[PDB]
Amino acid sequence: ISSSFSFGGFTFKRTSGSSVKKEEEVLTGNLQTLKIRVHEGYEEFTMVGRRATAILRKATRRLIQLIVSGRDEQSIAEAIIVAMVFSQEDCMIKAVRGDLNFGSGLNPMHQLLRHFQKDAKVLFQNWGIESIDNVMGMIGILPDMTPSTEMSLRGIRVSKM
């Protein structure tokens, strides 16, 4: 199991928890079957990139929290997309529209990744929103990337730092 690695342009370091991997079949929003290696366990990570940084808390196919800071709207969105994919949420697999086609060297995680970096509107619209507590140093972010002190994309918060 890996504890430091790169994915989606970010450097990940596990800061607590553990996991195991299990091959599973999942069904996209277009009813295409993918085989992915699902991580089971609660883990926390730092994600660091050129234009954004985050703390990610995740469990088995579940994003628990993402606290993200970044240079601008597009950079923050890029980090959110990678976190959503990395979480392996079925919500995210079901947000695929059309087929995921072959590319040499691209495993299904990177197929998903490629798909949503092209256009994340369906992912953002179908992920879920939640009411948020007013917690110091954080704010919500809505599907359309606007700030909110009242609501947010589920599990997602934006920090200054």
Ligand X SMILES: CN1CN([C@@H]2O[C@H](COP(=O)(O)OP(=O)(O)OP(=O)(O)O)[C@@H](O)[C@H]2O)c2nc(N)[nH]c(=O)c21
The binding site for ligand X (CB under 6 A) comprises 1-2, 5, 7, 14, 19, 37, 39, 43, 58, 86, 88, 107, 109
How far apart are CB 147 and ligand X at their closest, in Å? 28
Q: State whether residue 69 is helix, strand or coil.
A: strand
Distances (CA, A) of 24 to 32, 34, 77, 151, 158: 14, 8, 28, 33, 32
Residue 86 burial class via C-beta count within 10 angstroms: exposed 0-12, middle 13-18, buried 19 and up: buried
Q: Which residue is nearest to ligand X (CB)?
A: 39
Report the residue number, 19 or 138, with the smaller CB distance to ligand X.
19
Residue in the block written with tokens 């990570």: 45
What's at 96, amino acid-wise? V
Q: State whether residue 123 is helix, strand or coil.
A: helix
Report the residue number, 2 or 149, with the smaller CB distance to ligand X.
2
How far apart are CB 7 and ligand X at their closest, in Å? 4
Tokens of 108: 């299904």
How far apart are CB 2 and ligand X at their closest, in Å? 4
Report the residue number, 85 or 138, with the smaller CB distance to ligand X.
85
Report the residue number, 18 or 149, with the smaller CB distance to ligand X.
18
| Residue 156: Cβ within 10 Å count | 28
How far apart are CB 94 and ligand X at their closest, in Å? 17
Residue in the block written with tokens 């234009």: 51
Report the residue number, 112 or 153, with the smaller CB distance to ligand X.
112
How far apart are CB 84 and ligand X at their closest, in Å? 11
